[PDB]
Amino acid sequence: FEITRPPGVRAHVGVIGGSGLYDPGIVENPVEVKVSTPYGNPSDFIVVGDVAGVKVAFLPRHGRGHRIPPHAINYRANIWALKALGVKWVISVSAVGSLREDYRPGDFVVPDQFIDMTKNRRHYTFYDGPVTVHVSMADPFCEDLRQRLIDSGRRLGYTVHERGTYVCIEGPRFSTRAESRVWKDVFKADIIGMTLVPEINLACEAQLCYATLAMVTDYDVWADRPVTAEEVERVMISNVERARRMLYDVIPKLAGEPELERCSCCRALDTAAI
Amino acid sequence: FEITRPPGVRAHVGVIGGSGLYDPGIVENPVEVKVSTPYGNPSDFIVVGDVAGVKVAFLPRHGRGHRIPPHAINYRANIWALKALGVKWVISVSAVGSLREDYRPGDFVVPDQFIDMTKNRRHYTFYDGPVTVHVSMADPFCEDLRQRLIDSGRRLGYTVHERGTYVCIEGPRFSTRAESRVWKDVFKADIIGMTLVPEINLACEAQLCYATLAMVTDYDVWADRPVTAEEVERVMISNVERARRMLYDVIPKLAGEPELERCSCCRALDTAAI
Amino acid sequence: FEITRPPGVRAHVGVIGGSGLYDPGIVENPVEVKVSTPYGNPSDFIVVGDVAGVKVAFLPRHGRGHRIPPHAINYRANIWALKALGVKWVISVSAVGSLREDYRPGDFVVPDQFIDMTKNRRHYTFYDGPVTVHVSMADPFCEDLRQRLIDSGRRLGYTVHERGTYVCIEGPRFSTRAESRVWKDVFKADIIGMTLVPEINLACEAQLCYATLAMVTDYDVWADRPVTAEEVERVMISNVERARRMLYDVIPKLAGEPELERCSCCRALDTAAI
Ligand SMILES: CSC[C@H]1O[C@@H](n2cnc3c(N)ncnc32)[C@H](O)[C@@H]1O
Ligand SMILES: CSC[C@H]1O[C@@H](n2cnc3c(N)ncnc32)[C@H](O)[C@@H]1O
Ligand SMILES: CSC[C@H]1O[C@@H](n2cnc3c(N)ncnc32)[C@H](O)[C@@H]1O
């Protein structure tokens, strides 16, 4: 079934850019690639090129120009396409709100947990039968990659919070005050966004080593002015150079393979399929 | 694209009637209007007429005869149609359950917050791309209208609770005891219903001044007999005259425009669109 | 509309088998039956036969061979088909995780409450209009049947926990640690599974006496190794003989009708329809 145009393209690391991150810059020797999927179009062309001898595939989850809101993303096509290229590692870069004073706008967070409060994403899996698949996601992120992101941040002198629970909401509207109080005071979540689920579910089912590098862009409803879309975008674009510096530091060190014992999803299917 | 039959019809105030409220009574000079929408049919004909020189559009959200349950309402068509008529203010009248002893059957509530626990409403926005829109809904109701409803209630001698958090559930079944304990004791919500979301989301995106006048019809699972549909309908029909008296008091005072500084959604799109 | 092949088949008790329970064994005089529904195919053929003079209909909710995951089950077709055969009682057998130390793998639980945390089941009711139906589900299980299951377990010498709140999650992935902490410590649920909703909703709307016999197969994320699909299936298959012994004990005593005063859904429609 699988066809790419141009043919024969492969990559080792995938980067899924979120808010503010619509192009890479600069993969060398870039090529725009069309990757067939059983689910139709990924968000945009995938750009494949080289970073210090490592082949990287970049996909803007919202499309170039931020054309696709969180609820309308073809998550299945995006992850299928990256898997079809041969990627082993996936770095997601995302904008998040903070539910705690000490996670400040401009700080990075490398989450370790999530809570799914989405509702309208239509498909939360690749496996609709006849092989029933129930992956374990107790520890949903790839720890090998998490630790490499934290190390890079520290080496560059950036603040990187080493843990966090991400509450994923449906959107596109932001939370009410009453909702935000539930997330913060009842669920004791740390950060909030709209795009993690079902991206992470699908990455795990695909046996990828996936981790999120989140940038705090706002304090949700808790600052004297509530979050707006314009604020999020401005803070992300202001800080995108720091995100790029982290990526160009991390990627050369991903030439090898994830360590199985620090990659919860890397053999996910072995015990998950009935 | 926009066509009405008859042509040329406009209105200033919209009223969305809930349980028990299927006709107005009596807009003068009433006309039934068909309003084209990109989403198909609204719940029913919209009835447009005059109340003390203010043009009012009435829409029964469940259709005449209560034909459309909460999960099957074409929320996008309903709000598009009201916007297309030129309305600035939208009064929703709704039946709710109470999660607290002091919010008693027969009392009105003018909520200020909500928590969305729906799942199956299919579209929670008008904006699916390519313009991505994330409206702020920290304070989701229009405060100008809330205060006018409270003032009218007080002037008429009715009990009107001046705040409340509405938990919106999916339905159509009512809550289990275990669910109701979560709403009451964990989320600390005050009232419960099925129709607020995504109606309110869409109204905000449409830059309307929307507020809910809720009538408590029951105590959910917490009275010696649990809520039934027959009970809700009976209590609403018993009290509909009081709701009508409030409307005929409020509407003449809506001849002007919402105050921007007391209308959180009136310029929602200015900072929400990417 | 209603056609069966072969024609004329009727049954009194339905059994909906979950994980590990794909065939009965041994209804005498078994026949595989096709039952037309307005919703298309049930999960598999329904097998009808006799158990000590009581006519029983068995339906594997996942299909033979566990071909259909929880989110892909045609719940409406399954319950319509059982109702069309004339069943009055429905015993569901299900695998669940435990959120409490004392509900141990191998123990049975007869839940009394549930919390619905699903999102993607598409239809949560039979009633989409023009008759609006809102069933009361404060006490969602049929108490007559619950008590008969508990009595059978005790008579056979098995551990059967006499109450429990079932949290139904969407899946197919298992919960994260952060999610499981919400279920356990915030919602104070006892057991967790994926298939109860909307099966139970539909059974109640169909005026069936429905109860769940759950078998604890795992402790979710809380044991030194998190739950896997292979573990659940193995524990269920190891214990399926005990589930069969309970069924063959209970079924002969269901020759009569549910007691109305101990069957919350048996006249559900009387007060639910508008
Ligand atoms: C560009 S504005 C929209 C983006 O903001 C992200 N995000 C940032 N702050 C928040 C917040 N407070 N709540 C929800 N999502 C947020 C979401 O993942 C979404 O794609
Ligand atoms: C006419 S019965 C159905 C209506 O009852 C309203 N409602 C009243 N009481 C409750 C309650 N306790 N829980 C949920 N919705 C309720 C819902 O919004 C729905 O449209
Ligand atoms: C055969 S593995 C999948 C089945 O496990 C059941 N189940 C058992 N343990 C759990 C658990 N911890 N969480 C969710 N569902 C579970 C679900 O209802 C599902 O159909």
mmCIF file with all atom_site columns, C-alpha atoms in Angstrom, chain A residues 4-132:
data_model
loop_
_atom_site.group_PDB
_atom_site.id
_atom_site.type_symbol
_atom_site.label_atom_id
_atom_site.label_alt_id
_atom_site.label_comp_id
_atom_site.label_asym_id
_atom_site.label_entity_id
_atom_site.label_seq_id
_atom_site.pdbx_PDB_ins_code
_atom_site.Cartn_x
_atom_site.Cartn_y
_atom_site.Cartn_z
_atom_site.occupancy
_atom_site.B_iso_or_equiv
_atom_site.pdbx_formal_charge
_atom_site.auth_seq_id
_atom_site.auth_comp_id
_atom_site.auth_asym_id
_atom_site.auth_atom_id
_atom_site.pdbx_PDB_model_num
ATOM 1   C CA . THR A 1 4   ? 5.937   8.105  -0.913 1.00 0.00 ? 4   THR A CA 1
ATOM 2   C CA . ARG A 1 5   ? 6.576   10.867 -3.388 1.00 0.00 ? 5   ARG A CA 1
ATOM 3   C CA . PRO A 1 6   ? 9.461   11.248 -3.869 1.00 0.00 ? 6   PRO A CA 1
ATOM 4   C CA . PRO A 1 7   ? 10.060  7.490  -3.442 1.00 0.00 ? 7   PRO A CA 1
ATOM 5   C CA . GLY A 1 8   ? 12.534  5.931  -1.054 1.00 0.00 ? 8   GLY A CA 1
ATOM 6   C CA . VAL A 1 9   ? 12.536  8.681  1.617  1.00 0.00 ? 9   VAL A CA 1
ATOM 7   C CA . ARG A 1 10  ? 13.328  7.581  5.195  1.00 0.00 ? 10  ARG A CA 1
ATOM 8   C CA . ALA A 1 11  ? 13.934  9.382  8.483  1.00 0.00 ? 11  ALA A CA 1
ATOM 9   C CA . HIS A 1 12  ? 15.044  8.509  12.028 1.00 0.00 ? 12  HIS A CA 1
ATOM 10  C CA . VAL A 1 13  ? 13.691  11.333 14.194 1.00 0.00 ? 13  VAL A CA 1
ATOM 11  C CA . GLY A 1 14  ? 10.317  13.016 13.868 1.00 0.00 ? 14  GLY A CA 1
ATOM 12  C CA . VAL A 1 15  ? 9.534   16.505 15.134 1.00 0.00 ? 15  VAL A CA 1
ATOM 13  C CA . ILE A 1 16  ? 5.888   17.537 15.514 1.00 0.00 ? 16  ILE A CA 1
ATOM 14  C CA . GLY A 1 17  ? 5.680   21.280 15.776 1.00 0.00 ? 17  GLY A CA 1
ATOM 15  C CA . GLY A 1 18  ? 2.806   22.926 17.595 1.00 0.00 ? 18  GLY A CA 1
ATOM 16  C CA . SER A 1 19  ? 1.749   26.498 18.021 1.00 0.00 ? 19  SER A CA 1
ATOM 17  C CA . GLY A 1 20  ? 4.317   28.927 16.611 1.00 0.00 ? 20  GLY A CA 1
ATOM 18  C CA . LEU A 1 21  ? 6.364   26.185 14.909 1.00 0.00 ? 21  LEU A CA 1
ATOM 19  C CA . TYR A 1 22  ? 5.241   25.810 11.300 1.00 0.00 ? 22  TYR A CA 1
ATOM 20  C CA . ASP A 1 23  ? 8.602   25.437 9.527  1.00 0.00 ? 23  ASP A CA 1
ATOM 21  C CA . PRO A 1 24  ? 11.913  23.882 10.707 1.00 0.00 ? 24  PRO A CA 1
ATOM 22  C CA . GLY A 1 25  ? 15.096  25.976 10.193 1.00 0.00 ? 25  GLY A CA 1
ATOM 23  C CA . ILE A 1 26  ? 17.320  24.719 8.847  1.00 0.00 ? 26  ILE A CA 1
ATOM 24  C CA . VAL A 1 27  ? 17.300  21.069 8.145  1.00 0.00 ? 27  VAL A CA 1
ATOM 25  C CA . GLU A 1 28  ? 19.852  20.886 5.337  1.00 0.00 ? 28  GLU A CA 1
ATOM 26  C CA . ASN A 1 29  ? 19.018  19.208 2.003  1.00 0.00 ? 29  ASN A CA 1
ATOM 27  C CA . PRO A 1 30  ? 15.248  19.585 2.690  1.00 0.00 ? 30  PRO A CA 1
ATOM 28  C CA . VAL A 1 31  ? 12.654  17.770 0.655  1.00 0.00 ? 31  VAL A CA 1
ATOM 29  C CA . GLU A 1 32  ? 8.889   17.976 0.935  1.00 0.00 ? 32  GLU A CA 1
ATOM 30  C CA . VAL A 1 33  ? 7.419   14.464 0.997  1.00 0.00 ? 33  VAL A CA 1
ATOM 31  C CA . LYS A 1 34  ? 3.949   13.087 0.427  1.00 0.00 ? 34  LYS A CA 1
ATOM 32  C CA . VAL A 1 35  ? 3.358   9.890  2.418  1.00 0.00 ? 35  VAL A CA 1
ATOM 33  C CA . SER A 1 36  ? 0.307   7.756  1.652  1.00 0.00 ? 36  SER A CA 1
ATOM 34  C CA . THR A 1 37  ? -1.821  6.823  4.625  1.00 0.00 ? 37  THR A CA 1
ATOM 35  C CA . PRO A 1 38  ? -5.057  4.829  4.985  1.00 0.00 ? 38  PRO A CA 1
ATOM 36  C CA . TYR A 1 39  ? -6.558  7.862  6.705  1.00 0.00 ? 39  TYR A CA 1
ATOM 37  C CA . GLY A 1 40  ? -5.981  10.538 4.081  1.00 0.00 ? 40  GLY A CA 1
ATOM 38  C CA . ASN A 1 41  ? -3.875  13.635 4.302  1.00 0.00 ? 41  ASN A CA 1
ATOM 39  C CA . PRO A 1 42  ? -1.502  14.441 7.146  1.00 0.00 ? 42  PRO A CA 1
ATOM 40  C CA . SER A 1 43  ? -1.625  18.058 8.293  1.00 0.00 ? 43  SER A CA 1
ATOM 41  C CA . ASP A 1 44  ? 0.880   19.154 5.673  1.00 0.00 ? 44  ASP A CA 1
ATOM 42  C CA . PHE A 1 45  ? 3.850   17.998 3.689  1.00 0.00 ? 45  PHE A CA 1
ATOM 43  C CA . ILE A 1 46  ? 6.477   16.356 5.802  1.00 0.00 ? 46  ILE A CA 1
ATOM 44  C CA . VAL A 1 47  ? 9.857   17.997 5.402  1.00 0.00 ? 47  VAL A CA 1
ATOM 45  C CA . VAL A 1 48  ? 12.791  15.601 5.543  1.00 0.00 ? 48  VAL A CA 1
ATOM 46  C CA . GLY A 1 49  ? 16.394  16.607 5.842  1.00 0.00 ? 49  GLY A CA 1
ATOM 47  C CA . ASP A 1 50  ? 19.642  16.281 7.735  1.00 0.00 ? 50  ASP A CA 1
ATOM 48  C CA . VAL A 1 51  ? 20.720  17.652 11.120 1.00 0.00 ? 51  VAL A CA 1
ATOM 49  C CA . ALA A 1 52  ? 24.389  16.801 11.906 1.00 0.00 ? 52  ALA A CA 1
ATOM 50  C CA . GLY A 1 53  ? 24.044  13.519 10.018 1.00 0.00 ? 53  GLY A CA 1
ATOM 51  C CA . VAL A 1 54  ? 20.732  12.480 11.532 1.00 0.00 ? 54  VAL A CA 1
ATOM 52  C CA . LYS A 1 55  ? 17.707  12.286 9.223  1.00 0.00 ? 55  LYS A CA 1
ATOM 53  C CA . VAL A 1 56  ? 14.785  14.301 10.574 1.00 0.00 ? 56  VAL A CA 1
ATOM 54  C CA . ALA A 1 57  ? 11.135  14.493 9.515  1.00 0.00 ? 57  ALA A CA 1
ATOM 55  C CA . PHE A 1 58  ? 9.287   17.668 10.469 1.00 0.00 ? 58  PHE A CA 1
ATOM 56  C CA . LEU A 1 59  ? 5.480   17.862 10.524 1.00 0.00 ? 59  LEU A CA 1
ATOM 57  C CA . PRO A 1 60  ? 3.540   20.966 11.603 1.00 0.00 ? 60  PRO A CA 1
ATOM 58  C CA . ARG A 1 61  ? 0.532   19.521 13.395 1.00 0.00 ? 61  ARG A CA 1
ATOM 59  C CA . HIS A 1 62  ? -1.626  22.582 12.618 1.00 0.00 ? 62  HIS A CA 1
ATOM 60  C CA . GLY A 1 63  ? -0.361  22.819 9.031  1.00 0.00 ? 63  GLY A CA 1
ATOM 61  C CA . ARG A 1 64  ? 1.626   25.722 7.722  1.00 0.00 ? 64  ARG A CA 1
ATOM 62  C CA . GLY A 1 65  ? -0.166  28.922 8.673  1.00 0.00 ? 65  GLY A CA 1
ATOM 63  C CA . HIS A 1 66  ? -1.970  27.286 11.641 1.00 0.00 ? 66  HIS A CA 1
ATOM 64  C CA . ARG A 1 67  ? -4.872  26.175 9.437  1.00 0.00 ? 67  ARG A CA 1
ATOM 65  C CA . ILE A 1 68  ? -6.051  23.156 11.455 1.00 0.00 ? 68  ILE A CA 1
ATOM 66  C CA . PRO A 1 69  ? -7.400  23.510 15.023 1.00 0.00 ? 69  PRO A CA 1
ATOM 67  C CA . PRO A 1 70  ? -6.771  20.768 17.597 1.00 0.00 ? 70  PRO A CA 1
ATOM 68  C CA . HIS A 1 71  ? -10.089 18.967 17.177 1.00 0.00 ? 71  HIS A CA 1
ATOM 69  C CA . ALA A 1 72  ? -9.745  18.789 13.358 1.00 0.00 ? 72  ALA A CA 1
ATOM 70  C CA . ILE A 1 73  ? -6.228  17.324 13.128 1.00 0.00 ? 73  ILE A CA 1
ATOM 71  C CA . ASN A 1 74  ? -5.901  13.991 11.368 1.00 0.00 ? 74  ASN A CA 1
ATOM 72  C CA . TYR A 1 75  ? -3.920  12.425 14.164 1.00 0.00 ? 75  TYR A CA 1
ATOM 73  C CA . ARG A 1 76  ? -4.011  8.935  12.662 1.00 0.00 ? 76  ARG A CA 1
ATOM 74  C CA . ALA A 1 77  ? -2.588  10.152 9.331  1.00 0.00 ? 77  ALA A CA 1
ATOM 75  C CA . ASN A 1 78  ? 0.145   12.153 11.050 1.00 0.00 ? 78  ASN A CA 1
ATOM 76  C CA . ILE A 1 79  ? 1.462   9.290  13.162 1.00 0.00 ? 79  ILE A CA 1
ATOM 77  C CA . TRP A 1 80  ? 1.047   6.693  10.396 1.00 0.00 ? 80  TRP A CA 1
ATOM 78  C CA . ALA A 1 81  ? 3.091   8.888  8.079  1.00 0.00 ? 81  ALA A CA 1
ATOM 79  C CA . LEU A 1 82  ? 5.944   9.316  10.544 1.00 0.00 ? 82  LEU A CA 1
ATOM 80  C CA . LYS A 1 83  ? 6.005   5.578  11.263 1.00 0.00 ? 83  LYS A CA 1
ATOM 81  C CA . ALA A 1 84  ? 6.007   4.806  7.548  1.00 0.00 ? 84  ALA A CA 1
ATOM 82  C CA . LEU A 1 85  ? 9.176   6.904  7.155  1.00 0.00 ? 85  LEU A CA 1
ATOM 83  C CA . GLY A 1 86  ? 10.970  4.736  9.727  1.00 0.00 ? 86  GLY A CA 1
ATOM 84  C CA . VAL A 1 87  ? 11.192  7.168  12.616 1.00 0.00 ? 87  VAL A CA 1
ATOM 85  C CA . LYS A 1 88  ? 12.072  5.794  16.073 1.00 0.00 ? 88  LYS A CA 1
ATOM 86  C CA . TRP A 1 89  ? 12.001  8.998  18.137 1.00 0.00 ? 89  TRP A CA 1
ATOM 87  C CA . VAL A 1 90  ? 9.302   11.686 18.115 1.00 0.00 ? 90  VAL A CA 1
ATOM 88  C CA . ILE A 1 91  ? 9.786   15.073 19.764 1.00 0.00 ? 91  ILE A CA 1
ATOM 89  C CA . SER A 1 92  ? 6.597   17.049 20.169 1.00 0.00 ? 92  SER A CA 1
ATOM 90  C CA . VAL A 1 93  ? 6.858   20.768 20.804 1.00 0.00 ? 93  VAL A CA 1
ATOM 91  C CA . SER A 1 94  ? 3.729   22.285 22.333 1.00 0.00 ? 94  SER A CA 1
ATOM 92  C CA . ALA A 1 95  ? 2.370   25.432 23.918 1.00 0.00 ? 95  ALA A CA 1
ATOM 93  C CA . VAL A 1 96  ? 0.736   24.899 27.306 1.00 0.00 ? 96  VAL A CA 1
ATOM 94  C CA . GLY A 1 97  ? -0.944  26.883 30.036 1.00 0.00 ? 97  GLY A CA 1
ATOM 95  C CA . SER A 1 98  ? 0.244   26.682 33.625 1.00 0.00 ? 98  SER A CA 1
ATOM 96  C CA . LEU A 1 99  ? -1.893  25.801 36.646 1.00 0.00 ? 99  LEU A CA 1
ATOM 97  C CA . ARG A 1 100 ? 0.848   26.649 39.161 1.00 0.00 ? 100 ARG A CA 1
ATOM 98  C CA . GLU A 1 101 ? 2.746   29.830 39.993 1.00 0.00 ? 101 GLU A CA 1
ATOM 99  C CA . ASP A 1 102 ? 6.219   28.304 39.694 1.00 0.00 ? 102 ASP A CA 1
ATOM 100 C CA . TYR A 1 103 ? 5.671   27.072 36.140 1.00 0.00 ? 103 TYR A CA 1
ATOM 101 C CA . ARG A 1 104 ? 6.094   30.509 34.593 1.00 0.00 ? 104 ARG A CA 1
ATOM 102 C CA . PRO A 1 105 ? 5.600   31.764 31.019 1.00 0.00 ? 105 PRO A CA 1
ATOM 103 C CA . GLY A 1 106 ? 8.822   31.097 29.145 1.00 0.00 ? 106 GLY A CA 1
ATOM 104 C CA . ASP A 1 107 ? 9.702   28.015 31.169 1.00 0.00 ? 107 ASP A CA 1
ATOM 105 C CA . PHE A 1 108 ? 9.917   24.606 29.532 1.00 0.00 ? 108 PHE A CA 1
ATOM 106 C CA . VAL A 1 109 ? 8.213   21.545 31.015 1.00 0.00 ? 109 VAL A CA 1
ATOM 107 C CA . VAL A 1 110 ? 8.850   17.923 30.167 1.00 0.00 ? 110 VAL A CA 1
ATOM 108 C CA . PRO A 1 111 ? 5.635   16.235 31.322 1.00 0.00 ? 111 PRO A CA 1
ATOM 109 C CA . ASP A 1 112 ? 5.536   12.694 32.703 1.00 0.00 ? 112 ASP A CA 1
ATOM 110 C CA . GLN A 1 113 ? 1.737   12.161 33.013 1.00 0.00 ? 113 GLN A CA 1
ATOM 111 C CA . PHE A 1 114 ? -1.518  13.232 31.428 1.00 0.00 ? 114 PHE A CA 1
ATOM 112 C CA . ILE A 1 115 ? -5.242  13.260 32.034 1.00 0.00 ? 115 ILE A CA 1
ATOM 113 C CA . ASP A 1 116 ? -7.495  13.021 28.969 1.00 0.00 ? 116 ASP A CA 1
ATOM 114 C CA . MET A 1 117 ? -10.499 15.354 29.108 1.00 0.00 ? 117 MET A CA 1
ATOM 115 C CA . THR A 1 118 ? -11.104 15.418 25.353 1.00 0.00 ? 118 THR A CA 1
ATOM 116 C CA . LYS A 1 119 ? -14.324 14.190 23.800 1.00 0.00 ? 119 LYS A CA 1
ATOM 117 C CA . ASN A 1 120 ? -14.546 14.888 20.079 1.00 0.00 ? 120 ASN A CA 1
ATOM 118 C CA . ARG A 1 121 ? -11.429 13.418 18.491 1.00 0.00 ? 121 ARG A CA 1
ATOM 119 C CA . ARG A 1 122 ? -13.365 10.563 16.792 1.00 0.00 ? 122 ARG A CA 1
ATOM 120 C CA . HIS A 1 123 ? -10.562 7.967  16.851 1.00 0.00 ? 123 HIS A CA 1
ATOM 121 C CA . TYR A 1 124 ? -8.434  7.272  19.901 1.00 0.00 ? 124 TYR A CA 1
ATOM 122 C CA . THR A 1 125 ? -6.635  4.241  18.449 1.00 0.00 ? 125 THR A CA 1
ATOM 123 C CA . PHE A 1 126 ? -5.470  2.569  15.274 1.00 0.00 ? 126 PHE A CA 1
ATOM 124 C CA . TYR A 1 127 ? -7.092  -0.730 16.295 1.00 0.00 ? 127 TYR A CA 1
ATOM 125 C CA . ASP A 1 128 ? -10.804 -1.114 15.638 1.00 0.00 ? 128 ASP A CA 1
ATOM 126 C CA . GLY A 1 129 ? -10.679 -4.910 15.229 1.00 0.00 ? 129 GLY A CA 1
ATOM 127 C CA . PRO A 1 130 ? -10.347 -7.708 14.422 1.00 0.00 ? 130 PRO A CA 1
ATOM 128 C CA . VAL A 1 131 ? -7.158  -7.643 16.464 1.00 0.00 ? 131 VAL A CA 1
ATOM 129 C CA . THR A 1 132 ? -8.094  -5.959 19.728 1.00 0.00 ? 132 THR A CA 1
#
